[PDB]
């Protein structure tokens, strides 16, 4: 991450507008959907067999919120992103033993559920800077396999 | 696979999008440019400035394209068979490019079309770009 003024401007100023409770929820309920074999890791959350079903199950808002608030202290600490995430990273690699490229995904399906929300005012301009810290979380998060 | 779900959300998303395919194509490029750079590579011709007429220019055959494809989803492999060899045998690309673009594309419509990216929606077209994209790909496997 680097990340240049321009782009820090530009990912703190629509940051500003998102609805926490609800991106949370649409991107995790998201990754769910469009990957199915991310839902192995949730058998604690009850029912996600249909997309309402995962549409609906509160287990899943109620994560949604707290992994989009640790995105948002990522986002404080831009620096440092290592520090921030290491302890978390010890929880994916350890306990979890989540592989990485599911990060990526994650990752990119919060751009996705940005671009809905936000519509043009995500602009190519936009979506480069959140692909970089976006970028940025995963290597965060996979630390503990380096 | 592709199932008839998927097939319905695919063909009723690409008629809403219907004489704008063209600028979506432009833009998904756009987009892919300046997300993932290492991109740009395969286009050193190009005027890969942000509104050229070159991005634009392609950006509407990468749309005609799809929308050919959309029109054969039975027989992809038939349909994309030039492309095919296009990219695997002359411009020989590297397979993690097809994940890039068809993530800006999936963006890019996700943008001008937030009503219909509902998340079943979401999940076919995924399905759908990935489907074209092992197409391009097959002469490597
Ligand atoms: C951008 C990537 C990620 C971020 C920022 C992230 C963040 C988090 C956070 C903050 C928690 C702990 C909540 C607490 O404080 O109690 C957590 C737990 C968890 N994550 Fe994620 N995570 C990421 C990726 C993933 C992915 C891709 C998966 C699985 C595919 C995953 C599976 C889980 C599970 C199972 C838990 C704890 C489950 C439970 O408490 O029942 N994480 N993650
Ligand atoms: C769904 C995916 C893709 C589709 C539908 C697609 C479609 C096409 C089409 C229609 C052409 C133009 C054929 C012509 O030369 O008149 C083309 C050429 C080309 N494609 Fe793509 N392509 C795709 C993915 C990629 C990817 C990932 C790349 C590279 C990152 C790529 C790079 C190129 C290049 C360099 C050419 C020739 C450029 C030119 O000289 O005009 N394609 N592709």
Same mark, same amino acid.
């Given at each position: ?33 469009? =990957? ?59 306990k979890l033993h989540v592989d ?29 800077? =959140?692909?970089?810290?976006?970028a940025g979380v995963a290597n965060?998060?996979?630390?503990? =396999?380096? | ?41 395969? #286009? ?40 095919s060899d296009l990219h695997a ?27 219909? #990216? ?24």
């Open positions: 991450v680097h990340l240049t003024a321009e782009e820090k401007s530009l990912v703190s100023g629509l940051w500003g507008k998102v609805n926490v409770d609800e991106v949370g929820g649409e991107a995790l309920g998201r990754l769910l959907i469009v =990957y199915p074999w991310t839902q192995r890791f949730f058998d604690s959350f009850g029912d996600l067999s249909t997309p309402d079903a995962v549409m609906s199950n509160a287990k899943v808002k109620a994560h949604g919120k707290k992994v989009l608030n640790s995105f948002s202290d990522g986002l404080k600490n831009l620096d440092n992103l290592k520090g921030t995430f290491a302890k978390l990273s010890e929880l994916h690699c350890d990485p490229e599911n990060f990526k995904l994650l990752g990119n399906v919060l751009v996705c559920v940005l671009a809905h929300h936000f519509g043009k005012e995500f602009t190519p301009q936009v979506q480069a800077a =959140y692909q970089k810290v976006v965060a998060l996979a630390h503990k =396999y380096h | 696979v592709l199932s008839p779900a998927d097939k319905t959300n695919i063909k009723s998303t690409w008629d809403k999008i219907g004489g704008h395919a063209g600028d979506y194509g432009g833009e998904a490029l756009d987009r892919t440019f300046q997300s993932f750079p290492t991109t740009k590579t395969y #286009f050193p011709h190009f005027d890969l400035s942000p509104g050229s007429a070159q991005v634009k220019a392609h950006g509407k055959k990468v749309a005609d394209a799809l929308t050919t494809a959309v029109a054969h989803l039975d027989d992809l492999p038939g349909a994309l068979s030039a492309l045998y002359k411009l020989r690309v590297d397979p993690v490019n097809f994940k890039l673009l068809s993530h800006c594309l999936l963006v890019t419509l996700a943008c001008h079309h937030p009503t219909e #990216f509902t998340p079943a929606v979401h999940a076919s077209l995924d399905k759908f770009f990935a489907a074209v994209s092992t197409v391009l790909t097959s002469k490597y496997r």
